[PDB]
Amino acid sequence: PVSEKQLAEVVANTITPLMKAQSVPGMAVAVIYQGKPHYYTFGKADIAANKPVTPQTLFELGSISKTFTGVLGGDAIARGEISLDDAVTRYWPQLTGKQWQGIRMLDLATYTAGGLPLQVPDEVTDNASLLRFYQNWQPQWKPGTTRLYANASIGLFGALAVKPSGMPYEQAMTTRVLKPLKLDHTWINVPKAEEAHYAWGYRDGKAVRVSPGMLDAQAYGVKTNVQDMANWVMANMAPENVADASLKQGIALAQSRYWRIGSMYQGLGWEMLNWPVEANTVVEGSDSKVALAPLPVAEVNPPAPPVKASWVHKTGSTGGFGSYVAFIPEKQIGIVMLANTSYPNPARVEAAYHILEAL
Ligand SMILES: *C(=O)[C@H]([C@H](O)CCc1cccs1)[C@@H]1N[C@@H](C(=O)O)C(C)(C)S1
């Protein structure tokens, strides 16, 4: 049984050279092992103000925000409020363009609508221009044939999934996901009182933080500390300990397999590979060139319920922040790495895999 001290050493020996090589100012790391999180903090949250990273330091999750989106959507499914096989137009009847016929909520959630682009364009600043954008979009592929990772895809899924609830997105997330899981320092908007804890991101030496954007909360806008993130991972690793029945089911639905794309499987926000997996498989899958490509899909129908023997993971970045989460439900181990610089995904994966290997 790996010592506590031994675990600390492995983390230090992996994280310290990583931060040196990748010019990372600060990191917070959690390792989940034997039923609880272990925290390790390194370096500075704010270089100018000389503020250390602590377990309260807020980082920008970037695309790891989508894991919340997926679980919130899963929760809505488990409540009976939406179905993944529903048409998109059931929840947005103003979306009258005929290219939307035959496109499901599932396709939005899992990036298979047929070529929705990575980003919502910057000129999209309100509901009218969001409508125009989707109305004018011309799919390069038929639905359910091609995966193209897209904020514009899951972002819309998220906005539509809450519509039957009657609640705005932020409120639905807080009441149905954050509060039940006691994630009380996880924010889309950082309150005044919490601002002291907000790290700065760093890029080529400049401090930066993420700007507002349409559908940001659904795709890339969440800020959190290492504690809430460790506990988010624990709930997703071990849903059997989550009390609220719809939320328990919603966590399962987000880790269900809907499509196979080579050696990876798409869930709701979460991505999965079968365990055991070799480091090189997961690493080379995390390269931009692969991660941003249009690739063919193979449907999993019916969707496969969660496979415990999975490497379940998500990468996320903003201009100034670089983060990664992975866990293996079969082994009850997991890892959170939050950093205030966006360094290459392969380097996140390699470090995370090495640390979990030790367990
Ligand atoms: C998520 O990290 C990234 C989004 O494109 C971020 C959108 C933002 C808008 C303003 C600030 S960030 C996607 N997810 C990445 C990943 O590693 O999974 C990419 C590279 C696939 S793009």
Curated annotation (Swiss-Prot):
One Pfam match: Beta-lactamase
GO CC entries: outer membrane-bounded periplasmic space
Keywords linked to the UniProt accession: Antibiotic resistance, Hydrolase, Periplasm, Signal
Annotated active site: S63, Y149
Record's subcellular location: Periplasm
UniProt cross-references to InterPro entries, sorted A to Z: Bact_CellWall_Synth/Modif, Beta-lactam-related, Beta-lactam/transpept-like, Beta-lactam_class-C_AS
Effect of A298V: In strain: Q980R
Phenotypic consequence of P37S: In strain: MHN1
EC numbers for this chain: 3.5.2.6
Annotated residues for binding of substrate: K314, T315, G316
Example of a GO biological process term: response to antibiotic
Domain of life: Bacteria
Reactions catalysed according to its record: a beta-lactam + H2O = a substituted beta-amino acid
GO molecular function: beta-lactamase activity
Other notes: The sequence shown is that of strain P99. The class C beta-lactamase family has a specific amino-acid numbering system known as SANC, for structural alignment-based numbering of class C beta-lactamases, or else the simpler name structural position. A multiple sequence alignment was used to derive a consensus sequence and then the consensus was numbered taking into account insertions and deletions. This allows use of identical numbers, e.g. for active site residues, despite differences in protein length.
Similarity comment text for this entry: Belongs to the class-C beta-lactamase family.
Function statement: This protein is a serine beta-lactamase with a substrate specificity for cephalosporins.
NCBIfam families, per the entry: bla_class_C, blaACT, CMY2-MIR-ACT-EC
Record protein name field: Beta-lactamase
